[PDB]
Ligand binder design. Structure first.
Ligand SMILES: Cc1cccc(C)c1O
Ligand SMILES: Cc1cccc(C)c1O
Ligand SMILES: Cc1cccc(C)c1O
Lengths: 168, 168, 168, 168, 168
């Protein structure tokens, strides 16, 4: 690219991989959201929580794709793997799955930051710090808070209802 | 009728029957509503839920009667049978009874749609699709969601109170 | 009932009967209204007059049902008999039928008031006086005024049109 | 056409025919409107009624032409036959002629719907149901209501005047 | 009195007694209210419920005193007996005590109405019907509704908390 400067092929490839991970996360959250919208699950607050996260993850992917082009890299898309489960169990099970997912995204962000530092690419490092790393820490803290509250509420049916009504 | 066109006697009769079913449903919901207003039941959210449905079903009947006249058919009214119960048990029992009732109305709508299709009466088919079929699907989904939440809440007294307070 | 006080079984039963009479009146007015909406009758002011009365009578029934519960009585519903006619003739015939109907409701109100007085139930007596007796006197006077005007207008077709256009 | 999909030549031709029928109806209503504007007829409400219908029918034709292009069919225009009469008699005669005209348009709509169903063309079927079939049923009901009122008013001159003044 | 007309000494005395009963009820509610404000009871919604009732009963007494003077009777005050309890137990116990109290006031109202009827004093009868009898029926129905909800909630501590939070 006529504009490409200080942008390694290793970072370019890792950015494409991260786009795939964010889109896969978005898809997972779409599945989680609609599972809680089932008439035999019917926890609307939980459905809304996950549908909002599907949107956030898609936005993250789009920000990464915008950055790829700004740097003169070339977006390459791969298949989006279907989510790991078809049914997500209880709100507790779902929130545990979500925190696992977020920690995996966060690790990928940290890995890419480390690569950027090794390649002396401060624009990449700043980009990740500014738009992703703090968002992930905040989200993981929120999920941990939710998990603790869900666990303390498990009369499991009553607890699940109250969490959805009074927290979400 | 000077205006009657493509409107079979079979559909005309079936529309009159459907008016009766909607008015009977409205009456059933009136009974459900006032049962939950009893001082020894006293679940105001549940009373409101069913009184609103009584109004919706009456409106449905009135829309059908308007359509009967628009097509040049002749409204014929029959007795409105009293509701199947005098006392409706718990919120769970009542919501189960309501979903049974709605599924029976929906089946009648589907039967009339099938008759309209067989008689090549697209105005009737459109009318039902536009004003009734989706309303019924939405309502049945809502009732199913409510049933699931009520069931998960059954400390049955506490659960019944919380559902009325926090959902309805 | 824990709340029931000075409320006789005779009044409780008579209130349930009166609910049935009001709902039957509402149904009769629904039939009258839609008859005047027929394309071969087509008197919109008359249709509106009777549909408004259907609503008023239903509201009366609902007020009675509310009162039944306030007093600790138990609502019991019976079948709603179909209206006495399928076709209602001229506006004159219909208005005569309506005044007959209202006078029958008024007599039932007066009978219930008399029962309340005999049972020394002043809350019932006040309730009827406050919400029903004057409403009925006003409505019957209005119908009598309408009958007189309709009769003076009978060139019967022209008169019927003018009454609908200029009074209703 | 590059865009044409599931759109039969039979439906394409029938749509062109229907455009012609709607434009012919519009022309007929233009003639009716100006006849009632003659100084020796002079019924302004009747003139307005028919001029409004001329506009509605032209709009219907334009909607059909828009749809023809949306589907990749090719609009073909034919002569517009002059209306069946040069003078339209009384308001009663004119309203009878209008209801005959509307019933013929409605039959053409029903015929085209049947063709669409036979050709498994649900976009066409929906289009007609959504924009034409209910409009026609409503209009025919209104005309039938008007005919009944005009007939009841026939002192024919006085009745014609009053209908124009008080209904139209 | 120069103004006294159709106002018996029996009714005058009974009105003074009723003033005392209303003021005693107000005092009882003051005691109930402050009991629920104790730091070792601490149910603010319940405190508010009873303090509002203390105000309503005082207003009732003041209305009776105003009426006594309007009729030319002479207000005579007696001691106000201290409430029947110093401590009121649970919300359930308190609501039971309140409904007992209200039923006793209602019986006194009914007794005075009967006296008025026997003395042919229609102003008194109207006064009681208009300002007291329906208020009492409404309040007793509300208390019965509350009792039913409290009973269904008895995990008694949790139920008491939830009723205070979500109903009161
Ligand atoms: C491509 C994709 C997959 C899953 C969820 C979303 C929102 C999305 O855009
Ligand atoms: C139950 C019932 C019967 C007839 C008319 C009305 C409005 C109604 O609610
Ligand atoms: C005199 C009296 C006693 C108790 C409560 C109140 C409000 C009151 O005025």
């Amino acid at each position: 690219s006529q504009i490409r400067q200080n942008y390694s092929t290793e970072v370019e490839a890792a950015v494409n991989r991260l786009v795939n991970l964010y889109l896969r996360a978005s898809y997972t959250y779409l599945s989680l959201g609609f599972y809680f919208d089932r008439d035999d699950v019917a926890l609307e607050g939980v459905c809304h929580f996950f549908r909002e996260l599907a949107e956030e993850k898609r936005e993250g992917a789009e920000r990464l794709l915008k950055m790829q082009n700004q740097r003169g890299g070339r977006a390459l898309f791969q298949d989006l793997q279907k989510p790991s489960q078809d049914e997500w169990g209880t709100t507790l099970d779902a929130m545990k799955a979500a925190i696992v997912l977020e920690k995996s995204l966060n690790q990928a962000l940290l890995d890419l930051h480390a690569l950027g530092s090794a390649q002396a690419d401060p624009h990449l490092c700043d980009f990740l710090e500014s738009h992703f790393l703090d968002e992930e820490v905040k989200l993981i803290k929120k999920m941990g808070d939710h998990l603790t509250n869900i666990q303390r509420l498990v009369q499991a049916g009553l607890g699940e209802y109250l969490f959805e009504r009074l927290t979400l």
